[PDB]
Amino acid sequence: VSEIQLMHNLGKHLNSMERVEWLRKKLQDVHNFVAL
Numbered sequence: 001v002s003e004i005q006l007m008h009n010l011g012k013h014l015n016s017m018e019r020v021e022w023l024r025k026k027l028q029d030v031h032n033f034v035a036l
Helices: 005-012 017-027
Strands: none
Touching: 005 017
16 A cells, blocks of 8 residues: 555665665755765
8 A cells, every 4th residue: 555656666666775776866856966
C-alpha cells in the first residue's frame, strides 16, 4: 500500500547501498543538484 507505480518508480525503490542513490537523486531533484 502507498508504493504505487509512480511511488515504486521513485529511485526504482531500493534497500541500503541502492537506497542511497534515491537520497542522492532526491537532492539532485530539488535543482538538478548532482550529489555523490
